[PDB]
Amino acid sequence: ENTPLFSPSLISPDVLAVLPADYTIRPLCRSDYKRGYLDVLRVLTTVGDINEEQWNSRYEWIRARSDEYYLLVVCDGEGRIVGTGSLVVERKFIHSLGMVGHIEDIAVEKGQQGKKLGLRIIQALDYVAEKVGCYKTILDCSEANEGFYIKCGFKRAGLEMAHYY
Amino acid sequence: ENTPLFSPSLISPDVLAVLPADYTIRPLCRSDYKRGYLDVLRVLTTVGDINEEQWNSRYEWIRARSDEYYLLVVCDGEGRIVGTGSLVVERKFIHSLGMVGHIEDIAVEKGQQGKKLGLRIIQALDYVAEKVGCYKTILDCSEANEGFYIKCGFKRAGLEMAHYY
Ligand SMILES: CC(=O)SCCNC(=O)CCNC(=O)[C@H](O)C(C)(C)COP(=O)(O)OP(=O)(O)OC[C@H]1O[C@@H](n2cnc3c(N)ncnc32)[C@H](O)[C@@H]1OP(=O)(O)O
Ligand SMILES: CC(=O)SCCNC(=O)CCNC(=O)[C@H](O)C(C)(C)COP(=O)(O)OP(=O)(O)OC[C@H]1O[C@@H](n2cnc3c(N)ncnc32)[C@H](O)[C@@H]1OP(=O)(O)O
Ligand SMILES: OCCN(CCO)c1cc(Cl)c(-c2nnc[nH]2)c(Cl)c1
Ligand SMILES: O=P(O)(O)OC[C@H]1O[C@H](O)[C@H](O)[C@@H](O)[C@@H]1O
Ligand SMILES: O=P(O)(O)OC[C@H]1O[C@H](O)[C@H](O)[C@@H](O)[C@@H]1O
């Protein structure tokens, strides 16, 4: 299936305009399993082993929530996935039933790093978040990659704390 | 309506066992609008103005997702809400289609602070997260409240970064 996860109208036109020639940013679709999506996530952390039937199940759970999960991909000239980025919109009671944008799982293929593809992904995810009416966008990072997020216009706002099971 | 948001079986029995006499922790229900729920959230940040019809709409959106949004309350001997705590379970592709527990919007009524109610809320939310199969629980905090989260068993794991709109 080639049906976008969410509306292509949510993709930043200004970002599309300034990508390198023949590169694009678009919503995830189900067939992206075959276009090297999970490969790109291997630069981020352990993906483990995921067959197409498991893919299709998780894809459908997410599609049943395309009003929360905004997953998009960067594609090169040859339609290969070279970049990934997620926004998850949390609904709150606070801030007059406000909404918070959470940026997750930003990855660019090693051979493709250092070309602004990460920046375009963040600019696209910030465009989605503003447009669906989030009051702020937040994310968690390491010391080692804080400087990328500063170059994207993010500011330090507190501490991530964790409990492992 | 007095129907729990989620199954009371997800409430930590060990936490219920050690609360102060006549205090309880239970899932949110829709009638909690009248039991001072939003009052408690006033200690956390701006709630703004929220009528019962807006409450009912947001409550129903969340109930349509009680497999993601685990909101629970602490009640005193007189059935007043004195504490609130949220877990939101993110679905991932990474970690073999893993799940991450996000702790949000922890609040205890000022007159009721310093009695372990915050600790019981975190222990209850960590019980939910393990039980539905999260690989870790994370949250964002300030320097000023990092020491509460350390006493709860959390460790510093990175930086929260933010963009405001
Ligand atoms: C919320 C999260 O998901 S945090 C997890 C982030 N992901 C990872 O760490 C996975 C591994 N790394 C990557 O996949 C990528 O390198 C990313 C996404 C961090 C950055 O993407 P790239 O395409 O490599 O970066 P891009 O070229 O857009 O960088 C923008 C600017 O930041 C700089 N930059 C990139 N990474 C870093 C860094 N770690 N520290 C400081 N500066 C950096 C670039 O040099 C560029 O600088 P310029 O504007 O002065 O040219
Ligand atoms: C993920 C998030 O939501 S972060 C936002 C947190 N919420 C807020 O900041 C709102 C305002 N504060 C509150 O509502 C509450 O005070 C809470 C939730 C922070 C803590 O709840 P309380 O019921 O006050 O704390 P509780 O009594 O369970 O505290 C556990 C221990 O931590 C201590 N503690 C409580 N707050 C702090 C703090 N800010 N710094 C250091 N230690 C603290 C207590 O003294 C207690 O110590 P002990 O085990 O040595 O007795
Ligand atoms: O900054 C993103 C990390 N957080 C904050 C606390 O862990 C986060 C991430 C997601 Cl993806 C979510 C979320 N998950 N589903 C809906 N929203 C929430 Cl509440 C918080
Ligand atoms: O595999 P983990 O330990 O969860 O880390 C994987 C990544 O997930 C999230 O998107 C966080 O923003 C990153 O800080 C983290 O690098
Ligand atoms: O009103 P905000 O600026 O979003 O802050 C309100 C709270 O929301 C979240 O639960 C965060 O964990 C806290 O760090 C923050 O205090």
Residue numbers in the entry:
A (entry chain A), B (entry chain A): 26 to 190
Give the text the authors published on this PDB structure.
Gna1 (EC 2.3.1.4) is a member of the Gcn5-related N-acetyltransferase (GNAT) superfamily and is present in yeast such as Candida spp. Previous work has shown that A. fumigatus Gna1 possesses a classic GNAT α/β-fold, forming an obligate homodimer. This dimer shows extensive secondary structure swapping with substrate and cofactor binding to the two active sites that are formed by channels on the surface of the enzyme, composed of amino acids from both AfGna1 monomers.
As an alternative approach to achieving AfGna1 inhibition, we aimed to exploit the protein tunnels that connect the dimer interface fragment binding pocket to the substrate-binding sites (distance of 1 to substrate-binding site = ∼8 Å). Extension of the fragment scaffold into the active sites by traversing these tunnels would effectively generate a competitive enzyme inhibitor by blocking substrate binding at both AfGna1 active sites (bifurcation approach). To test the ability of a bifurcated derivative of 1 to bind AfGna1, 3 was synthesized. An AfGna1–3 complex structure, which additionally contains Glc-6P, indicates that 3 is accessible to the fragment-binding site, despite narrow tunnels linking the fragment binding pocket to the enzyme active sites. Like fragment hit 1 and 2, the important binding interactions and binding mode are maintained in the AfGna1–3-(Glc-6P) complex structure. In addition, the hydroxy functionality of the N,N-diethyl alcohol moiety displaces His-127–coordinating water molecules and interacts with the acceptor nitrogen atoms of the His-127 side chains. The introduction of a para-anilino anchoring point for bifurcation leverages the sp2 character of the anilino-nitrogen, maintaining the planarity necessary at the branch point for correct N,N-diethyl alcohol orientation whereas ortho-dichloro substitution positions the fragment along the 2-fold crystallographic axis (with a positional shift of 0.6 Å and 19° reorientation from fragment hit 1). Moreover, the positioning of the Glc-6P 6.2 Å from the ethyl chain linker of 3, visible in the AfGna1–3-(Glc-6P) complex structure, is suggestive of fragment-linking approaches toward AfGna1 inhibition, albeit challenging because of the limited size of the tunnel. In line with this, derivative 3 did not show inhibition against AfGna1 in a recombinant enzyme assay, probably because of the inability of the N,N-diethyl alcohol moiety to extend into and block the enzyme active sites.
